[PDB]
């Protein structure tokens, strides 16, 4: 009665592009070209696929299958599998809030850059502005110029002193106050995601049509543009030059594993929610396969889109694209690439489509990012929730805005690094390992192959059973152990993070998954009788 069965998706292509749109984001565009260039060049293509075939694809497919089979949220699905691990469904929620605290602000920057890209003369071309210093030296000026340790470029000046305004803060210690411009930008973004989420999967399935197809068009325009630029072969050479001695280093394998894990994004509850709304007899294998393989291919061509332009930039300057692509962060897009676009014909066009591309790269992923949590909460508190969806979605968008006010400060970029590298990563990897173990070693892999055999009509191959049993948990275990054994020393804009930053990162990191052990203790302490009977009634799913 009343609700009973849940709703279903409006078309196969909508869900196929929704998952693709969530999988593809900023990092696919710029993190993969950098990590591919600095870790063996073209030879990075070899371990990147292995970590996919053995690690990424099995988690992606197993998550999309569990989601499309059980049709439950990230929280209520554990009550029907392993109640003690229900805290997982909560942990991810908290995790999402941290991601949403910064991932949108980044887009805000692009948005503030987009609304600043409608002028006939781009603001970051000249030095006669209200934010430039006396060190600002630009081009279209007297030739012979020689760069100095204190000299700066109008683009670097525009990012540093105008939009980001990071010169007004001394670090994590002093970062206040808040920039109202980026607050309004992130409000507009939280509004464009509000009207794209508030109705449920209908609008995020109609809006995804645009958010997921535009980046390929923009990447195509930038691609055929950058291929025509003189001296673009240098960036391609630096992008594909095989350096097989890097493969001897045990670091590049960990870099590839981590990169393909985030980029694929299993273990976050997004694929669970997206798979939940679908036909029971609908095929899941082909969907997961195609989407992931596209997500990789798209990264691969994005590499060219970036390195052709950076090759042209190295030609205009003096070569060694590694020198011009030293900084691995937002500065590679907001300063370097932007300065390269400004010196091209129809600069307004390629700027509008570039920043618009960035925003459209971000939107689909935060759409999903919220979609998983919303689905989880609505499925965990039914009839206490779902009274309206707009109320909860609004409470989340607003919560993310107040959670992003720390990032909208002048030293907000500092917090972005802190949140992006020390907090979300190791916790998502941790909960992904816990989930992979619970589904593989608690619920039983044989019964899982039986559920896929019921849904798809055939039992999964031995390659996948042997992947879920041993290969995938060791795949996540390797990354977690590698990170925990040596957290990277953070540095951003000639500013090294204090030594206690990692403690703050761990505090944010630890505060996310306090619920899984405290919930195991909660259910283990609430259910009467012996601990063996409590863990037996707590590990085995509900019989009816």
């Amino acid at each position, epitope marked *: 009665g009343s609700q009973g069965e849940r709703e279903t998706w409006g078309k196969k292509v909508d869900f196929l592009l929704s998952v693709i749109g969530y999988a593809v984001d900023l990092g696919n565009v710029w993190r993969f070209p950098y990590i591919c260039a600095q870790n063996g060049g073209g030879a990075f293509l070899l371990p990147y696929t292995i970590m996919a075939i053995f690690g990424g694809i099995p988690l992606f497919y197993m998550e999309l299958a569990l989601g499309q089979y059980h049709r439950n949220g990230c929280i209520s699905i554990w009550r029907k599998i392993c109640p003690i691990f229900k805290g997982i469904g909560y942990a991810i929620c908290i995790i999402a809030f941290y991601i949403a605290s910064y991932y949108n602000t980044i887009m805000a920057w692009a948005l503030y850059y987009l609304i600043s890209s409608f002028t006939d003369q781009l603001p970051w071309t000249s030095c006669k502005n209200s934010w430039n210093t006396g060190n600002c030296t630009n081009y279209f000026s007297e030739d*012979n110029i*020689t*760069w*100095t*340790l*204190h*000299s700066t470029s109008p683009a670097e000046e525009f990012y540093t002193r105008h939009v980001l305004q990071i010169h007004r803060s001394k670090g994590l210690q002093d970062l206040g106050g808040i920039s109202w411009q980026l607050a309004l930008c992130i409000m507009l973004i939280f509004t464009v995601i509000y009207f794209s989420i508030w109705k449920g999967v209908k609008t995020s399935g109609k809006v995804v049509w645009v958010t997921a197809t535009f980046p390929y068009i923009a990447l195509s325009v930038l691609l055929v543009r950058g291929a025509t630029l003189p*001296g673009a072969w*240098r960036g391609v050479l630096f992008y594909l030059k095989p350096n097989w001695q890097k493969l001897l280093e045990t670091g590049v394998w960990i870099d590839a594993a981590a990169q393909i894990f985030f980029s694929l994004g299993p273990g976050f509850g997004v694929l669970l929610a997206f798979a939940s709304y679908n036909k029971f007899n609908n095929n899941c294998y082909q969907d997961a396969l195609v989407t992931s393989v596209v997500n990789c291919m798209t990264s691969f061509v994005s590499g060219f889109v970036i390195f052709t332009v950076l090759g042209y930039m190295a*030609e205009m*300057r*003096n*070569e*060694d694209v*590694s*020198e011009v692509a030293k900084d691995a962060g937002p500065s590679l897009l907001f300063i370097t690439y932007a300065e390269a676009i400004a010196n091209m014909p129809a600069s307004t066009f390629f700027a509008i489509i570039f920043f618009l591309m960035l925003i459209t790269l971000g939107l689909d992923s935060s759409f999903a990012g919220l979609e998983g949590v919303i689905t989880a909460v609505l499925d965990e508190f039914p009839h206490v929730w779902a009274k309206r969806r707009e109320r909860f979605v609004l409470a989340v968008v607003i919560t993310c805005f107040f959670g992003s006010l720390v990032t909208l400060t002048f030293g907000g970029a500092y917090v972005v690094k802190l949140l992006e590298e020390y907090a979300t990563g190791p916790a998502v990897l941790t909960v992904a390992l816990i989930e992979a173990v619970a589904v593989s070693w608690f619920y039983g892999i044989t019964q899982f192959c039986r559920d896929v055999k019921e849904m798809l009509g055939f039992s999964p191959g031995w390659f996948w059973r042997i992947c879920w049993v041993a290969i995938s948990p060791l795949f996540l275990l390797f990354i977690i152990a590698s990170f925990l054994m040596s957290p990277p020393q953070l540095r951003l804009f*000639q500013y090294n993070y204090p030594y206690w930053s990692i403690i703050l990162g761990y505090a944010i990191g630890t505060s996310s998954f306090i619920c899984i052990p405290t919930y195991i203790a909660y259910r283990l302490i609430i259910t009467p009788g012996t601990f063996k009977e409590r863990i037996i009634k707590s590990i085995t799913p509900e019989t009816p």
Partner: antibody
Framework: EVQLQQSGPELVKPGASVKISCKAS????????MNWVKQSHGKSLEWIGN????????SYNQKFKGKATLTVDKSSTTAYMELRSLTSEDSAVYYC????????????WGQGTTLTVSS | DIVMTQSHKFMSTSVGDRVSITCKAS??????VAWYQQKPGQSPKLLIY???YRYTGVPDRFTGSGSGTDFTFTISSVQAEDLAVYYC?????????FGGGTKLEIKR
């Protein structure tokens, strides 16, 4: 004008260490990278590494990693290079030369320091 | 790394003749080549930067040409005080390497 005055010649026994100074004048010391070029007897020039005077931002060569240590002092605008584990190959003339960030040329050099590693 | 190869270790010329020294690099360099002059007993002195551009305080008789991997340093009127060892050096990729050196001996 721009003058880079190094230390005098040094005769040191093998296995010891030696530090060479580099007093800069005639320009804004915090504006340019400070470099060290090794020139062997009858050989070519060999870039050892640079250092950023603002924070001591060193950048050594893979061939000199663990061989040379570059330091800098802003209070007196003077750079230093220390060499440990001295052998017969280190007996050469060392220069300290100023250089901008881009284009990375060596505009002004020091007079040189004749190093002799022998017992 | 980069290997700056100066094939001619020694070159003979006369006072007033046109002399040109060649510099061969490993990979493509575009226009990132500097020419230094080291007189016997003195420190190297920068003459050319970025293939062709002359530095401040350098006579007009010293020129530079080339665009790619092979570069040429040209002296139009050789003087008696031009007797020195000439070095070429790339300034694009880390690390910065030098050439073997061409001791220009004067024939009379």
């Amino acid at each position: 004008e721009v003058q880079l005055q190094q230390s005098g010649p040094e005769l040191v026994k093998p296995g010891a260490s030696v530090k060479i100074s580099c007093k800069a004048s005639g320009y804004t010391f915090t504006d340019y990278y400070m470099n060290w070029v090794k020139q062997s007897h009858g050989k070519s020039l060999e870039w050892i590494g640079n250092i950023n005077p603002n924070n001591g931002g060193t950048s050594y060569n893979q061939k000199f990693k663990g061989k040379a240590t570059l330091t800098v002092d802003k209070s007196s605008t003077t750079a230093y290079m220390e060499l440990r584990s001295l052998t017969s190959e280190d007996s050469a003339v060392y220069y300290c030369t100023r250089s901008p960030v881009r284009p990375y040329y060596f505009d002004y050099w020091g007079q040189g320091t004749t190093l002799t590693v022998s017992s | 790394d980069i290997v700056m190869t100066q094939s001619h270790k020694f070159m003979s010329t006369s006072v007033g003749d046109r002399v040109s020294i060649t510099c061969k690099a490993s990979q493509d360099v575009s226009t990132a080549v500097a020419w230094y002059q080291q007189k016997p007993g003195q420190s190297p002195k920068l003459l050319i930067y970025s293939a062709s551009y002359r530095y401040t305080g350098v006579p007009d008789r010293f020129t530079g040409s080339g665009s790619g991997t092979d570069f040429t340093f040209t002296i139009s009127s050789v003087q008696a005080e031009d007797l020195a060892v000439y070095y070429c050096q790339q300034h694009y990729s880390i690390p910065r390497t030098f050439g073997g050196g061409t001791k220009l001996e004067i024939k009379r």
